[PDB]
Design a protein around this ligand. Structure first.
Ligand SMILES: Nc1ncnc2c1ncn2[C@@H]1O[C@H](COP(=O)(O)OP(=O)(O)OP(=O)(O)O)[C@@H](O)[C@H]1O
Ligand SMILES: Nc1ncnc2c1ncn2[C@@H]1O[C@H](COP(=O)(O)OP(=O)(O)OP(=O)(O)O)[C@@H](O)[C@H]1O
Lengths: 193, 100, 58, 48, 212
RNA sequence: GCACAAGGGAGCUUGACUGCGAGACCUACAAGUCGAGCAGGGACGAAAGUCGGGCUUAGUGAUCCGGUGGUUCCGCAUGGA
RNA sequence: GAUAUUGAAUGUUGGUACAGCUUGUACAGGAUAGGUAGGAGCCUUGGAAACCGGAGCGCCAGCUUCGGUGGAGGCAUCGGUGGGAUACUACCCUGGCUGUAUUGACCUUCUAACCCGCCGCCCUUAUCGGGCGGGGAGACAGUGUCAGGUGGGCAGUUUGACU
């Protein structure tokens, strides 16, 4: 079954229409990946489905409420060290807790994506989990998401991360979302055709 | 180099998948003759990091390219600094298993 | 061509397409010729497939 | 481009008004106080 | 184990599921049909058993003000000198049950998780933090145990002993099942009943009917 | 047509209002244009007053059928739909 | 193409209706602690420590079961750790096997429906058809409804005004 549906969803800001006539579906455990040029609503779409931003046109219907939002630059991210399944993530990846401001840039996304995976989520709205990760953590992502509770929607900019960790692709393009199921390697085979 | 008619947006009301690009333009417009790239290739795009993968090979030297990618550095590496236990390891090759 | 059990035969009506163009069309009987004893003997007549389901003895 | 604009009320929620505006010179949702004949007073309206 | 026994058979049969040497305790598991990830479909209510449980408790109270004066005559072991959490720090073998009053609960709570992973933290969702401390001591010793569900939506309830007679556990399971029927939250999706497992402490479970 | 500004500035603003409208111009009709004034609520102004878009005339199309919003309307016996 | 004529078996991958139960460690640790509640004892001649073999996972640390040698020993609070205690109760759907009943799809195979402008016999002096006996095809085909594509092979029509 599906969980979230989108129909003719658009968005208006002070460049031009970013986004128009958007028809897509989230399902029961799909691994959906956003690809698209940066600045093309790659993560504005995530704030539309989160209801973090109110869309100008189009109807966004959802069923299950839990929306885990893991964005880029959450900018003195909180230290509510609660619900200790987070600390399993915070200790596989080898990251200490002690500070936030003196940490390197490499540790802070691994300490934000940590809190995001384990609040409670049947639906992940995460921006870019593949920035400043080493391969022992990049490989740990795919074993998370394969062994995961529900649907994941990510904005990767990686041909590497989507050969393993994708079922659908919601490619953003010339102001229009188009979805394709199955892989990313055969996706460009589909587009060129 | 990826902008629309966006000559005046506030530069972190921008997109934030730009603003790496703003830094990048401000460097490469002016021939600064020394660069250090503390992790460039992660916010960029598959058409954006590719041309930076390409032109930095044709760059005229003195580059310090930190990159957690394994495939970006295959175009921008001659020598390596493998930071490890008890400080640096200045490598000039793979330098594993202590060549005998 | 009519069924021997009930008076079920070919009728006629309209082929109404899109734009409601009324072409003129026929409606056949799903009849399916089988061997039945209409008299004391079996005679192999037309039947219908509405009347063949569980009602009439083969 | 120039768009047709309805200006729905807030005290009543009733629409009551139309004028035009730019999507570029006025990219935000515009608001004015006009007269609501259900509310029988001046009321802040709202593009919907 | 293919057959679902009755309530009148399983009470007489969990007599026979006493294997060890201690006089064992018959307890009931019940699989719920709510969603444990949502906080709205949460059954958390406790009730008194008309024939009891068969075990001695030691309830220590955190009564404040005049409420300590009625707490020392109901049957409680130790009340306190209005603050003995410093005596709780670096020591404190806790005994059975911790209840409190709705005034110092916040103060005790701001002390940390010395009650989090130990399951005795006062919380007024369970009827244990109230102004009626005299009525709260007298019902917990003779019945009521603090009841809440897990992270997968299940409730555990001690209804009694092996040595109780056959007519005691029938009313105990009847009272607890009628309580579960009155404690049903809103927006419950579909079939509410999944499984009843009546067991003793030393023995397997018997999946029996809910309404016989 | 305009230098008493209708042309220029700045402040404050939403009258680019609601119900109308005596009487006129125009015109085969359908339409189109002007309208003092009244009431309700406002804007500016100390007040007088002016404001129902722009300096006037262009910037647009009938009905039918559908959509949206609202309504002391109807609703195929009655209550709803 | 579906559906109706049009059913008989043998496997298949999903899912239910009844059912089996196993899988669980960041470090500290004597270790593999998923958590919520009771908890100072339980397991043993209807066998404990230990050895060994194998189904099974494994983040290869060590667990899990079953069977076989053994002979009275394991194991729990407390001791230590650290965010949290080890003997039952359930679950968590993370990660399997096996059977019953249907469910959808696919492959084969059968024959009794249907078909035979195949043979022989009779009706019968008949290249008709039709009864019987074989043979062949055979759930197809044909045929009826429903549907999509294709379709100038055919049909009704349109193909403006000023000048
Ligand atoms: N809040 C905003 N207001 C106005 N314009 C914006 C805003 N956010 C983005 N834009 C414009 O739209 C473009 C797309 O922004 P968007 O929300 O898609 O981020 P994104 O591109 O998805 O992030 P990334 O660049 O990592 O893909 C921006 O680059 C900017 O030019
Ligand atoms: N000022 C500081 N105070 C405390 N710890 C620090 C400080 N600077 C760096 N560290 C520690 O050094 C470790 C490594 O940081 P480093 O500067 O190497 O960045 P990094 O490890 O490459 O991460 P990233 O790739 O995100 O930049 C981090 O775990 C961080 O806590």
């Amino acid at each position: 079954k599906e969980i979230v549906t989108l129909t003719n969803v658009s968005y208006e800001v002070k460049d031009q229409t970013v986004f128009k006539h958007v028809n897509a579906s989230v399902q029961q455990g799909d691994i959906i990946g956003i690809i698209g040029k940066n600045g093309a609503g790659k993560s504005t779409l995530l704030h539309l489905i989160h209801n973090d931003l109110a869309p100008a046109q189009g109807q966004i219907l959802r069923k299950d409420i839990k929306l885990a939002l893991v964005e880029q630059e959450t900018a003195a991210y909180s230290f509510a060290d609660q619900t200790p399944a987070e600390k399993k993530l915070l200790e596989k990846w080898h990251v200490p807790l002690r500070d936030f401001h003196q940490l390197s840039g490499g540790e802070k996304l691994k300490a934000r994506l940590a809190k995001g995976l384990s609040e409670d989520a049947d639906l992940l709205l995460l921006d870019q989990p593949t920035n400043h990760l080493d391969e022992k953590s990049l490989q740990f992502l795919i074993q998370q998401l394969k062994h995961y509770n529900g649907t994941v929607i990510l904005v990767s900019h990686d041909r590497y991360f989507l050969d393993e960790a994708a079922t659908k692709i919601w490619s953003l393009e010339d102001q229009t979302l188009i979805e394709f199921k199955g892989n990313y390697s055969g996706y460009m085979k589909f587009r060129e055709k | 180099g990826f902008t629309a008619a966006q000559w005046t947006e506030p530069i972190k009301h921008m997109s934030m998948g730009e603003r790496v690009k703003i830094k990048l333009m401000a460097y490469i417009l002016e021939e600064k003759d020394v660069l250090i790239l503390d992790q460039p290739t992660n916010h960029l795009d598959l058409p954006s990091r590719e041309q930076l993968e390409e032109t930095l090979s044709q760059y005229s030297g003195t580059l310090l390219a930190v990159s957690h990618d394994r495939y970006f550095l295959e175009k921008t590496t001659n020598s390596k600094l493998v930071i490890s236990n008890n400080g640096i390891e200045k490598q000039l090759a793979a330098a594993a298993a202590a060549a005998a | 061509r009519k069924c021997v059990i009930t008076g079920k035969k070919t009728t006629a009506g309209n082929n109404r397409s899109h734009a409601m163009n009324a072409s003129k069309r026929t409606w056949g009987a799903n009849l399916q010729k089988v061997r039945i004893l209409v008299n004391g003997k079996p005679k192999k007549v037309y039947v219908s497939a509405r009347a063949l389901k569980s009602g009439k003895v083969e | 481009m120039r768009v047709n604009i309805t200006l729905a009320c807030t005290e009543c929620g009733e629409r009551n008004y139309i004028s035009k505006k730019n999507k570029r010179n006025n990219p935000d949702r515009v608001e004015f106080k006009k007269y609501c004949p259900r509310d029988k007073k001046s009321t802040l309206h709202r593009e919907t | 184990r293919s057959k679902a026994y009755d309530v009148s058979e399983a009470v007489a049969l969990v007599k026979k599921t006493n294997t060890a040497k201690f006089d064992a305790t018959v307890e009931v598991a019940f699989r719920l049909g709510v969603d444990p990830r949502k906080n709205d479909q949460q059954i958390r209510g406790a009730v008194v058993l008309p024939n009891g449980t068969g075990k001695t408790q030691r309830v220590l109270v955190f009564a404040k003000g005049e409420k300590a004066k009625e707490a020392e005559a109901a049957g409680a072991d130790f009340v306190g000198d209005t603050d003995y959490i410093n005596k709780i720090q670096q020591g404190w073998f806790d005994f059975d049950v911790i209840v409190a009053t709705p005034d110092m609960m916040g103060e005790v709570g701001k002390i940390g998780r010395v009650l989090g992973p130990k399951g005795l933290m006062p919380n007024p969702k369970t009827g244990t933090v109230t102004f009626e401390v005299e009525k709260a001591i007298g019902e917990i010793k003779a019945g009521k145990v603090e009841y809440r569900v897990d992270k997968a939506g299940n409730i555990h309830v001690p209804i009694g002993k092996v040595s109780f007679e056959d007519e005691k556990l029938v009313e105990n399971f009847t009272t607890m099942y009628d309580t579960i029927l009155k404690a049903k939250p809103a927006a419950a999706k579909g079939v509410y009943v999944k499984n009843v497992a009546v067991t003793s402490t030393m023995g397997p479970g018997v999946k029996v009917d809910s309404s016989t």
